[PDB]
Write a protein that binds this ligand. Structure first.
Ligand SMILES: Cc1ccc(NC(=O)Nc2cccnc2)s1
Ligand SMILES: Cc1ccc(NC(=O)Nc2cccnc2)s1
Lengths: 304, 304
């Protein structure tokens, strides 16, 4: 028992982290096979970032201008190309530590592990969620760009995120491994304000199920609700609407605990309307929305 | 910016995880050099655990009865010995992935990363703290015993914990890598109740400094306090007494933010006396005590 914000083991991703330097800017790159992926803003100065024309800036760069270093050995760059907001640097050596991998584009509400890196050296791993406004609340400093988000399915790493920028509000924006930003963000130092950060309702419900499984049941009430009634209260509290798909996704948790999904919704509804009254759920004084239903089943069954 | 509960990269420790089976019980082992470390309760049945005599149970075991498996290859056990509550199984092959390592015995309040394992396969990594009552609040299921806690200093892994048991209250107990339990716990299925779980005051203060650095300053007040006055309030709230050593340890954070330690204590004192009033600090509705001052400096400077 016990429930923790758990990240995937990072070893498979550590073996892929390299340092990419272009001129005076050094950031992280992802080395899979003979390609190094990194944010295209590696070719910009702090000034260029105000209004960069990446195709024009790129014309002044040659293969030898991108310095790729894995550990302490230099990789030879034999080609370079821009795919949306990421650069793909073709090296002459395939990464001997390349795990089985996929590039995936996740949905808001989905969670992933982040391996925070600096100078191609991993320094920490934490679990994150793609927010409904397509931002992430990470812990990234200058030098962390190119740090990646991933999920592991037994031995295959699905890379879903690459860190690109910090918005004025302290939140983070990045792309999938094809260079496309999550949300409406652009890699330019301009007024980009994130939208409403709504709570991922289905994730909260899954975490309420994890609490029940782990012994915290004080919030279980004698009430029930409908999807429409619950959603009225959810909208008022800036919670994402719950769909029949979410109810279905919660099915295995509903089955394990014997608590119907709609009954758990009524419990959540009272927690919203009345607060925690100074109490904690799984050691938390707020409703946690960074565990998917899949994460709760995984942690509660020990999926390796 | 941004502040997350960050664990060390687990790759160096993944390369050390093996499966140890003795009879019908399978748990995790730590393979460093030619020795496999694991909880001595691998030799017990569910029944033996009521009142085990480990020296007597051990007399019935031979080298060939301990099955050690790394990945999918079997390791040959050429010797076995008991050191306190851990078994050291001498294998004929040194682990080629043995990192530079140390066995350390941490103090309560110290934090560490846990690589939760099942059948010698790592399944998740999270950050933990050794509680002042020598328990840990982990996320461990059956099969997780032998999962280890560690800290990394650049390339040297300091192993500080090995998971052994879950108490009736859902909390966890384990040993350092020399077999000695943290706290008064014993590896026996008996009434073992943990003591008062007090809040690690110096860790809370460090996290208040991290909040200031990351923009959350609403809790900064116009007051100051003394160590004796603050400690009067701290005792009342089941907070550990703050010593001059803790004030000194906070010095670099006090210096970075320009907020004296005693002023931060007065801010904490009002948070204790008045609550959060429905507000959050670093996205948390309670006072977080699982970041040391060293963890805050590390995360805020990007120590790789
Ligand atoms: C619009 C932008 C262009 C380049 C940008 N660079 C960053 O945001 N870097 C950074 C710093 C601190 C934390 N995380 C990331 S922002
Ligand atoms: C006194 C004891 C002897 C053997 C014990 N085995 C465990 O506690 N195992 C376990 C199960 C779930 C979670 N973590 C650990 S307890």
């Amino acid at each position: 028992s016990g429930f923790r914000k758990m990240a995937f083991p990072s070893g498979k991703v550590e073996g892929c982290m390299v340092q990419v330097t272009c001129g005076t800017t050094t950031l992280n790159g992802l080395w899979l096979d003979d390609v190094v992926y990194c944010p295209r803003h590696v070719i910009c100065t702090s000034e260029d970032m105000l209004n960069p024309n990446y195709e024009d800036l790129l014309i002044r760069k040659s293969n030898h201008n991108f310095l790729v270093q894995a550990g302490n050995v230099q990789l030879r760059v034999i080609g370079h190309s821009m795919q949306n907001c990421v650069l793909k640097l073709k090296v002459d050596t395939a990464n001997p530590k390349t795990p089985k991998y996929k590039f995936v584009r996740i949905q808001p509400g989905q969670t992933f592990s982040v391996l925070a890196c600096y100078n191609g050296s991993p320094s920490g791993v934490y679990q994150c969620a793609m927010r409904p406004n397509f931002t992430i609340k990470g812990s990234f400093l200058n030098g962390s760009c190119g740090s990646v988000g991933f999920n592991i399915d037994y031995d295959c790493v699905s890379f879903c995120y690459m860190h690109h920028m910090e918005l004025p509000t302290g939140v983070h924006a990045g792309t999938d491994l094809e260079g496309n930003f999550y949300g409406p963000f652009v890699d330019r130092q301009t007024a980009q304000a994130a939208g409403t950060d709504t709570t991922i309702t289905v994730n909260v419900l899954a975490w309420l199920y994890a609490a029940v499984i782990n012994g915290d049941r004080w919030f279980l009430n004698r009430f029930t609700t409908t999807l429409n009634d619950f959603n009225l209260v959810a909208m008022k509290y800036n919670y994402e609407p719950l769909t029949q798909d979410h109810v279905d996704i919660l099915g295995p948790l509903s089955a394990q605990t014997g608590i119907a999904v709609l009954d758990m919704c009524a419990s959540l509804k009272e927690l919203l309307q009345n607060g925690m009254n100074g109490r904690t759920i799984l050691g938390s004084a707020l409703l946690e929305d960074e565990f998917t239903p899949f994460d709760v089943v995984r942690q509660c069954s020990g999926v390796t």
